[PDB]
RNA sequence: AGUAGCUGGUUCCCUCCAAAGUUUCCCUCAGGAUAGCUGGCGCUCUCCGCAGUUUUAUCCGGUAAAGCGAAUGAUUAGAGGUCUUGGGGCCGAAACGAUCUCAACCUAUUCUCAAACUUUAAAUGGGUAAGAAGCCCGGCUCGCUGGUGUGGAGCCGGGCGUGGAAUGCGAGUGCCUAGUGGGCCACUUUUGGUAAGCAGAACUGGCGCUGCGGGAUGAACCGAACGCCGGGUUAAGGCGCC
RNA sequence: UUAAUUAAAACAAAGCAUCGCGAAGGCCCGCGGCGGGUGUUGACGCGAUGUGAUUUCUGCCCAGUGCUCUGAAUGUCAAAGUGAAGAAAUUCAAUGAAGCGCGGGUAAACGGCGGGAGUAACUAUGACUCUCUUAAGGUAGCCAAAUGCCUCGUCAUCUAA
RNA sequence: ACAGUGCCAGGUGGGGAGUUUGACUGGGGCGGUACACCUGUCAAACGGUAACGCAGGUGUCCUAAGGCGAGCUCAGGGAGGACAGAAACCUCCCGUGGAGCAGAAGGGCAAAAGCUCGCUUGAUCUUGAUUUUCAGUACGAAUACAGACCGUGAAAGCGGGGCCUCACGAUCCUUCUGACCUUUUGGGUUUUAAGCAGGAGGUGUCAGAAAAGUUACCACAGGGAUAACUGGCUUGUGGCGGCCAAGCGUUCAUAGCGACGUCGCUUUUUGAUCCUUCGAUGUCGGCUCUUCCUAUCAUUGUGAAGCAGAAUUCACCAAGCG
RNA sequence: GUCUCCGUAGUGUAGCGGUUAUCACGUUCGCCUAACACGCGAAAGGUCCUCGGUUCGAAACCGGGCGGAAACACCA
RNA sequence: GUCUACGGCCAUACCACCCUGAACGCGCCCGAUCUCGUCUGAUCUCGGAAGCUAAGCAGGGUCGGGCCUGGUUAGUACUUGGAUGGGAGACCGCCUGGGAAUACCGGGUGCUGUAGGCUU
């Protein structure tokens, strides 16, 4: 069997990337995290305090508490057949603002502006996204050239 | 006699019979675990809300 | 003494090198990988024939040692002790274990080291012989005999490279004329159009 | 493991940091009139032999050292127990380590 | 009528749903408790919510492969410098004087490698988001923070519905609960072993609990899952005769 | 002698040798007693063991474990009793029966009874020597024996083998 | 005035009584601890994942090796300097860490987490929340806060042990600490006792019985979950047979052999496993008797020899008969 | 094979983390004897089995090798 | 064009050598009374302004090493899902999708925020 040790199996997970050791850039501490934010957890081995447990590396959660150095995150953890909402305390070195919602937030604004710009114009615009449709018909110009004939090459034993 | 030791075989089949439900979400979340100092003031902010009722 | 090589013919286990976790490995049977005129310049032996493996398998250090002797003896007999240069291209790094019986049974059955084997792939070169061009038939016969010391299928293939170099034989000579290749003994050094111009001066002065 | 014979720690009576005398704690002798010892004697009296377990399979080779702190303020004289981790050798007020010295 | 975690038995029909041999604790290993799997009773709503799926964004990773003229470790061969050290000599009066020569050393090369190496780095995969609990305004409360009527949180009123990817589907919730807790097999991956119809794992699917067509025969293979029937057509397999 | 798978080399035996005891005793029975057996007995006896006729002999070891013997000279040592403190429960101290520790004896008590190296004028041996070593270091005898793994030991005899 | 008896107390007491005499486990025992923990790997790029799988560690150590601040920079190497050399001390230069950080390993660290000084006790007092194993219980360990008291620094800050991942222990009992504390039963005072809170004494089989053997005189309930035959899969070992041809055979590889290598067959060897049989399949050998195989010793018919004869050796069809 | 244990001058042997590696025998030198022997006075002589590691320092402590000696191998 | 103080990302910014630097700066530099600290005013601290870009620093250079980024390697290796495909096996091919990394070749060699200077 395996040991129940807290940091077992994190030889590569928590190590620093190649040629990125040493000082922690100070903009890691200048980020502003607010209640209700979405953050990606990524344990950093340089700071051994507030280190999220390995099961939370690479999971994204919601900030519910902010203290002097860490935040409280509500992050889903699956244990057998159930998913629990777990409240962890993680120092702000090990998290980073998620960009997932931005492409949504960027869309929310452009939609509301289009919905307001087209409304005053008495027209109709597309707001919902759509999956890529099958490409429509088109002509391909040969430009007075014959397509290159291709043939399979003979087998040659390159040993 | 020796016997089998461990297996998770057949387990994901049992987990999915009643579905792997995500946690229940309500629009109000409990204030359990939030900073005591911050919460002490939040109670004080709610306590005196009636003061500015007339201005509102 | 040792088990029939059919017991270890297949690459079943992960590579098991002689390291600090595997101690007590006996020395390999093959200790010499080059013989012939190792000191011949790159240009004396333009021909190179390979014995190529058709099978993914393990070759024992005994079969590598046996083939080396088999191939070498026929070359010396037909081209002279200074008319060729052989290079065995496989080193027996994977270690095979033995669970020696006479009783515990299958309890505590992890085995002690027994020997070493080289793990070869399909298309990988087992050994190579470079000599002069009028020894093309002798090279083919030297390698054809060595195949009988190995399990599985091999192919003898005459390379289009120049000797033991990585450059095509047909364009080797011109590259040497343009000083893109500088002989360094058994092989050549490649001169790119890079780095301090001073080197270019020394080559072209 | 060496501990000073004095330390400046929190006194609960004084409610502030105070100097303290540090000594090792020793179990006192067992009273014959503790209710559990009274109950034991009554149960062990008569026939039947032993009536409670007698522990044999000792495994620990050390004990947790308990320091008996005592406020030095004349009026307070409050005492407290303070446990440190296990150690095979414990001394109070040993010689302090010196650095850069020839080891004779 | 001693106890028995152990062996043997346990009596009518139909209808509906339908397992487990796994987690943790146990002087626990032929047994229990425990969660999971099951059934029953419902109830709260519905005619927004959800998903063993994709799509679009966004993170996580160190396996496959690859690398070793990149760090660690392992390893073959030549070549160029060499006095900065040693082995053989060798003129000697003898020295770092001369003469070589083979070693080590350094410099670019070169063959071959890693489950407990790595600069790189897949596929498959794991989180999250895809709106009304949102978006935007005006105001009030604070003992919290504060150059600042700052900051953050809370509360109040108000305006916005093209319900903001595809597909499919009604959901949620609460009590009581039995049996199980010996498993075994196959594709792929995989540890030990010479190997085993051997021992041990991952994923999924099976047999167990399951008939049926085919594989002559057969727990698992291939096809396909079953109310009692008629007609038609198929699957996998077949069409000398049986 | 194992009725009903073992008739024997097992048990017994005479012989031999240890042990306790002079009766308020030794050994033993019994819930109990002015109880009972030996005992209607008295050391040439009774009680407890071992070996096992005769013949010859019965070596060394008391460290271990047992048994036994001496004891206020003297460590520990219960109850009771003595003293002191205290309001008392209680606490403390002193004193110290056997038994243990201390010291002798005892093996026909249970039992035990070594290792290495050199060395004689051919070689082999090694009477002899040095060394480490335990409470003694297996003596007189006897042996591939019902006891010796190696082992179907080696030589001889018995056989054609 | 003791024997003695009655009742207490200490010793002795397998003469006798009751009881126990772990578990895992390629049968059990012996062996080991995979029984409580930690690192790397296995492990198939989230997490999880087994074997008596692999390589290792643990039951400690530290008044500083805890806390803060300041100043410095390490291993190794090059070149110099009296005695001085491979190695003492001084100097300059290069030096991404190739050192050090208690220990196993892995991660982390360069005006620091390392070395040296200075001041110190955040290793203190206190209520909750969280994380890890997980049943989302306990312990242990750990994480953010909050309330006090302090240390340190010029200060921002940092610190409620060790840079991180290990270093540990329920109920009952006992012992210590805390309060102008509660109770101590009709009331009061005082001893005592019991409570309430927090430490310690230990259960290592580490969620925690108080525990030696033998049975061949043996017993019962079971087990083919499990060993001792046969049989089955396997064939390492055993047996038998090919391929290559360095050599042997005076010469000559192959008449006859055949190294180094390598490919098979068989189940007349022994193993490995544990599928059938423990409400029983009678367990060695011999005797008897029949049959079958060929991997042929003889005999029939043949090929080849380093076959003159004779004798022998290799090979073929061959199991009729011995 | 599991487990325990041991290697120290030429021989047998000690070594209470800091020894001028202890003791006896042996060898060498000088005395004594006509000479030898005993005996008296002096001296040399340890690859501490080997590699590596912790340690300020290891013959010792800790693992891995090379030899060596023990106790176990039972129910069938 | 560019510097100084404080920065963000943290080599396109590093390392080696060479050339050039107007003005203001930043430095080198001169001293030790005071503050402060040393074996040593070398460093640290302090008071200065004679001299100099020699060095640091800045910009530029090198068929420069590194770094960054492309190409090639290559639709290759590997891989999801499929077959009563091949093969004694070892393995391999195809179908449906995804798709790397060296050697080799090219290009590039800091951007930028706040505050304050210099530069007709
Ligand atoms: Mg089970
Ligand atoms: Mg394997
Ligand atoms: Mg009593
Ligand atoms: Mg009955
Ligand atoms: Mg049971
Ligand atoms: Mg228990
Ligand atoms: Mg059963
Ligand atoms: Mg990994
Ligand atoms: Mg690989
Ligand atoms: Mg069961
Ligand atoms: Mg299996
Ligand atoms: Mg099985
Ligand atoms: Mg069943
Ligand atoms: Mg089913
Ligand atoms: Mg079916
Ligand atoms: Mg068939
Ligand atoms: Mg029909
Ligand atoms: Mg048919
Ligand atoms: Mg009878
Ligand atoms: Mg006797
Ligand atoms: Mg005695
Ligand atoms: Mg005896
Ligand atoms: Mg004897
Ligand atoms: Mg004798
Ligand atoms: Mg008794
Ligand atoms: Mg008894
Ligand atoms: Mg057992
Ligand atoms: Mg995975
Ligand atoms: Mg510092
Ligand atoms: Mg605080
Ligand atoms: Mg520290
Ligand atoms: Mg009264
Ligand atoms: Mg018996
Ligand atoms: Mg008997
Ligand atoms: Mg059998
Ligand atoms: Mg064989
Ligand atoms: Mg010959
Ligand atoms: Mg069975
Ligand atoms: Mg039967
Ligand atoms: Mg029968
Ligand atoms: Mg029968
Ligand atoms: Mg035949
Ligand atoms: Mg100027
Ligand atoms: Mg100065
Ligand atoms: Mg200049
Ligand atoms: Mg360049
Ligand atoms: Mg710039
Ligand atoms: Zn006090």
d(CA A66, CA A57): 20
Per-position DSSP letters for B16-56, written without gaps between them: TTS--PPPP--SS---TTS-HHHHHHHHHHHHTGGGGTTT-
Per-position DSSP letters for C41-108, written without gaps between them: -TTT--EEEEEEE-S-EEEEHHHHHHHHHHHHHHHHHHH-TTSEEEEE-----EEEEE------TTTT
- Looking at chain A, which residue has its C-alpha nearest residue C168? A158
Mutation target vs B (from A61, A82, A89; most B CBs, 10 A cutoff): A82
Residue A18's contacts (CB-CB under 8 Å, 6 or more residues apart) are: none
d(CA C50, CA D85): 69
Judge whether B33 is closer than 8 Å to chain A, CB to CB. Answer: yes
Task: Give yes or no for CB of C193 within 7 Å of strand I.
Answer: yes
Rounded to 10 degrees, the C-alpha dihedral A139/A142/A143/A149 comes to 170
Protein-covered nucleotides of chain G (CB closer than 7 Å) are: 24-28, 31, 34-35, 37-43, 46-56, 59-65, 97, 106-110, 113, 116-117, 120-125, 128-133, 135-136, 143-150, 158-159, 161-169, 172-179, 192-195, 198-205, 209-212, 225-226, 236-237, 243-246, 259-264, 271-273
Q: Give me the resolution in angstroms, 1 decimal.
A: 2.9
Task: Give yes or no for CB of A8 within 7 Å of strand E.
Answer: no
Query: Residue C173: what are its φ and ψ, rounded to 5°?
Result: -65, -45
Bridge partners (DSSP) listed for residue D3:
D92
First to last CA, chain A: 46
- CA D96 to C1' H56 (Å) is 18
Report DSSP state, residue A39.
E
* Span from the CA of A83 to the centroid of ligand 43 (angstroms): 73
- Is C154 within 8 Å of C63 (Cβ atoms)? no
Q: Which residues of A touch C159 (CB under 8 A)?
A: 159
Q: Which residues of C touch A159 (CB under 8 A)?
A: 50, 52, 123, 125, 155, 157, 159
Residue linked to tokens 């450059």: C167
């Amino acid at each position: 069997t395996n040991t129940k040790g807290k940091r077992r199996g994190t030889r590569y997970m928590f190590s620093r990337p190649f040629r990125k050791h040493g000082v922690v850039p100070l903009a890691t501490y200048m980020r502003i995290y607010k209640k209700g934010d979405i953050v990606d957890i990524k344990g950093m081995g340089t700071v051994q305090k507030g280190m999220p447990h390995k099961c939370y590396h690479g999971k994204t959660g919601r900030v519910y508490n902010v203290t002097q150095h860490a935040v409280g995150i509500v992050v889903n953890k699956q244990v057998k057949g159930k998913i629990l909402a777990k409240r962890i305390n993680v120092r702000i070195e090990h998290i980073k603002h998620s960009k997932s919602r931005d492409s949504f937030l960027k869309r929310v604004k452009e939609n509301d502006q289009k919905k307001k710009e087209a409304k005053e114009k008495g027209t109709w615009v597309q707001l919902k996204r759509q999956p890529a449709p099958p490409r429509e018909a088109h002509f391909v110009r040969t430009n007075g050239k014959e397509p290159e004939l291709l043939e399979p090459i003979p087998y040659e034993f390159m040993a | 006699a020796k016997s089998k030791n461990h297996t998770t075989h057949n387990q994901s089949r049992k987990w999915h019979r009643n579905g792997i439900k995500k946690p229940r979400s309500q629009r109000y979340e409990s204030l359990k675990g939030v900073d005591p100092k911050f919460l002490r003031n939040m109670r004080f902010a709610k306590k005196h809300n009636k003061k500015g009722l007339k201005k509102m | 003494g040792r088990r029939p090589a059919r017991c270890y013919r297949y690459c079943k286990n992960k590579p098991y090198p002689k390291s600090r976790f595997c101690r007590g490995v006996p020395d390999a049977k093959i200790r010499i990988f080059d013989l012939g005129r190792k000191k011949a310049k790159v240009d004396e032996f333009p021909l190179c024939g390979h014995m190529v493996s058709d099978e993914y398998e393990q070759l024992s250090s005994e079969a590598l040692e046996a083939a080396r002797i088999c191939a070498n003896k026929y070359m010396v007999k037909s081209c002279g002790k200074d008319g060729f240069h052989i290079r065995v291209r496989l080193h027996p790094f994977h270690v095979i274990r033995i669970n020696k019986m006479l009783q515990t049974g299958m309890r505590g059955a992890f085995g002690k080291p027994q020997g070493t084997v080289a793990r070869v792939h399909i298309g990988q070169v087992i050994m190579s012989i470079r000599t002069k061009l009028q020894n093309k038939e002798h090279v083919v016969e030297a390698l054809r005999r060595a195949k009988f010391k190995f399990p599985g299928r091999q192919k003898i293939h005459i390379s289009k490279k120049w000797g033991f170099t990585k450059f095509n034989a047909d364009e080797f000579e011109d590259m040497v004329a343009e000083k893109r290749l500088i002989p360094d003994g058994c092989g050549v050094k490649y001169i790119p159009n890079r780095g301090p111009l001073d080197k270019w001066r020394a080559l072209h002065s | 493991v060496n501990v000073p014979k004095t330390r400046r720690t929190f006194c609960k009576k004084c409610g502030k940091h105070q100097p303290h005398k540090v000594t090792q704690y020793k179990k006192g002798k067992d009273s014959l009139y503790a209710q559990g010892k009274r109950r034991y004697d009554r149960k062990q009296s008569g026939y039947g032999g032993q009536t409670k377990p007698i522990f044999r399979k000792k495994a620990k080779t050390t004990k947790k050292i308990v320091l008996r702190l005592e406020c030095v303020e004349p009026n307070c004289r409050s005492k407290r127990m303070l446990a440190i981790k296990r150690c095979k050798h414990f001394e109070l007020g040993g010689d302090k380590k010196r650095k850069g010295q020839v080891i004779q």
